[PDB]
Amino acid sequence: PQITLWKRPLVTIKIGGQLKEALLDTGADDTVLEEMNLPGRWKPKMIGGIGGFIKVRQYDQILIEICGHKAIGTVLVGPTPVNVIGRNLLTQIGCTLNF
Amino acid sequence: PQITLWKRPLVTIKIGGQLKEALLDTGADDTVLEEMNLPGRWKPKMIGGIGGFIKVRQYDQILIEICGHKAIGTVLVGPTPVNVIGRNLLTQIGCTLNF
Numbered sequence: 001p002q003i004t005l006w007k008r009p010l011v012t013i014k015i016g017g018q019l020k021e022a023l024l025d026t027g028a029d030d031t032v033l034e035e036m037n038l039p040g041r042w043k044p045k046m047i048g049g050i051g052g053f054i055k056v057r058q059y060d061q062i063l064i065e066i067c068g069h070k071a072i073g074t075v076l077v078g079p080t081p082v083n084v085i086g087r088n089l090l091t092q093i094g095c096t097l098n099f
Numbered sequence: 100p101q102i103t104l105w106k107r108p109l110v111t112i113k114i115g116g117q118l119k120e121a122l123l124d125t126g127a128d129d130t131v132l133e134e135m136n137l138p139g140r141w142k143p144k145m146i147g148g149i150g151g152f153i154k155v156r157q158y159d160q161i162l163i164e165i166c167g168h169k170a171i172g173t174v175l176v177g178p179t180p181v182n183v184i185g186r187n188l189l190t191q192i193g194c195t196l197n198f
């Protein structure tokens with residue numbers, strides 16, 4: 001589809017058998033999702049933006065479905081104010097910027 | 100143009116007669132640029148990111164050309180990790196997300 005940017009580009013995603021809302025975020029290198037009790041191992045990481053850094057848990061090879069488009073890659077989990085789909089997964093669903 | 104997301108969507112902008120590089124950031128409501136001198140009245144404001152809130156100077160009705168497309172809108176100046184073009188200007192240049 002085509003998403004205009006009058007409002008935040010929020011979409012429904014499916015991850016670990018859960019449905020959530022997340023932003024399609026071209027400014028996010030990597031996907032970051034709200035605290036959720038995901039199974040399996042992980043590696044600590046710190047990610048920075050406006051305001052500074054937050055600590056997150058990096059899970060690898062996680063399966064995510066974004067508007068029926070399946071993807072698999074890195075998902076960071078932590079106390080983020082918002083769920084964002086980053087470029088690591090946006091590339092996998094064919095998402096482009098167009099003007 | 101159509102921009103893929105395998106790398107950061109960085110483009111050249113012109114503001115206040117100066118060229119700069121900025122990130123097209125669909126997860127930013129607002130446009131925030133690193134510290135710089137801008138002619139025009141400004142008002143102090145607070146804006147919040149993933150790591151908290153920073154102090155910015157709000158300039159209104161600023162002319163800014165993004166990748167050859169002109170926009171006139173609000174520009175926040177302050178300690179952002181990188182120059183970001185947010186939705187307030189992305190809408191003006193006709194930018195949509197497509198997949």
Ligand SMILES: CCC(CC)CN(C[C@@H](O)[C@H](Cc1ccccc1)NC(=O)O[C@H]1CO[C@H]2OCC[C@H]21)S(=O)(=O)c1ccc(N)cc1
Pocket residue numbers: 025027028029030031032047048049050076081082084086122124125126127128129130131146147148149150179180181183185
């Ligand atoms: C380094 C480039 C940007 C910050 C400049 C990176 N951010 C994504 C960005 O889209 C962020 C995503 C974001 C959205 C909402 C709340 C926190 C973060 N938006 C943001 O900070 O926008 C601010 C400016 O406009 C306002 O509207 C949103 C907040 C304000 S981020 O959230 O900090 C981020 C950093 C690393 C990863 N892997 C994933 C996300």
